[PDB]
Amino acid sequence: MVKQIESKTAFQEALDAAGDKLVVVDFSATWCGPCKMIKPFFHSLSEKYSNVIFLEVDVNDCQDVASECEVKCMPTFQFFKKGQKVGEFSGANKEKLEATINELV
Amino acid sequence: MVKQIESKTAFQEALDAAGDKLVVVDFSATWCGPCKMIKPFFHSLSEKYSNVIFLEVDVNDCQDVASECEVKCMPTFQFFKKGQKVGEFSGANKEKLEATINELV
Numbered sequence: 001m002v003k004q005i006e007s008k009t010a011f012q013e014a015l016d017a018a019g020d021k022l023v024v025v026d027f028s029a030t031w032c033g034p035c036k037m038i039k040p041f042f043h044s045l046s047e048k049y050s051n052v053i054f055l056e057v058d059v060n061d062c063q064d065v066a067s068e069c070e071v072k073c074m075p076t077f078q079f080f081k082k083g084q085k086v087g088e089f090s091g092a093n094k095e096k097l098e099a100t101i102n103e104l105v
Numbered sequence: 106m107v108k109q110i111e112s113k114t115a116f117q118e119a120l121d122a123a124g125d126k127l128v129v130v131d132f133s134a135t136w137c138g139p140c141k142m143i144k145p146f147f148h149s150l151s152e153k154y155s156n157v158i159f160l161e162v163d164v165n166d167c168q169d170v171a172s173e174c175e176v177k178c179m180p181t182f183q184f185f186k187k188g189q190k191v192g193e194f195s196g197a198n199k200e201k202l203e204a205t206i207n208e209l210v
Contacts, residue, residue, distance in 0.1 A: 072138075084126055
C-alpha cells in the first residue's frame with residue numbers, strides 16, 4: 001500500500017528505512033486532473049510490487065519538500081535507491097511509470 | 106501594473122473588460138523556485154507594455170480556475186484575445202515570454 005508523507009522528517013526517515021529497496025514518490029496536487037486520473041493505478045502498483053516502496057506527497061501540504069526536490073509539474077514521479085535520485089519524469093503516463101520501475105528495481 | 110485575481114467571477118470579468126487587448130495570465134505557486142525567479146520580470150513587462158493586460162493567479166487560491174484552464178506546470182503563461190486562448194507555454198523563459206507578446210499583440 002501507499003505511504004502518505006506529511007513532513008520533511010517523515011520523508012527522510014522513509015528514505016532511510018527503505019534500505020536497498022527502490023522508492024517511488026508521487027508528487028501531486030488535489031486540484032490537478034491527471035493526478036486524480038492516475039491515483040488508482042499508482043495504488044494498484046503498490047499491491048503488485050511488494051518489493052518496492054510507494055510514497056505520496058501533496059505539494060501543498062509539504063511545500064518545503066516540494067521546493068527542495070525541485071518539483072515543477074504535476075504529477076512528478078521521482079525514483080530513489082539508497083538515498084539517491086536515480087530517475088525522474090512528469091505526466092500521467094501509465095506504461096512509462098511501470099516500465100521505469102522494471103528498469104530500476 | 107499586474108492585477109491579482111482571487112475568484113472565478115473576477116477572472117471572467119477581467120477577460121470581459123479587456124475588450125480588444127491581449128491578456129497575459131501567469132499561473133503560479135508560492136513554493137515554486139522559477140515562479141519566484143520570474144516575478145520581477147513579469148511586473149516590468151506590465152510597465153513597459155501599457156496596451157496589454159497582465160493578470161496573476163495563484164493556483165492554490167483559485168483551484169477552480171487552475172483546474173478549468175487545465176494547468177499542470179508552474180509557471181504557465183496563457184494568452185487570450187477576445188475571450189479566446191490564442192497561446193500557451195510553461196517554464197520561466199524570459200525571452201520567449203516577451204517574444205510571444207510581440208507576436209500576439
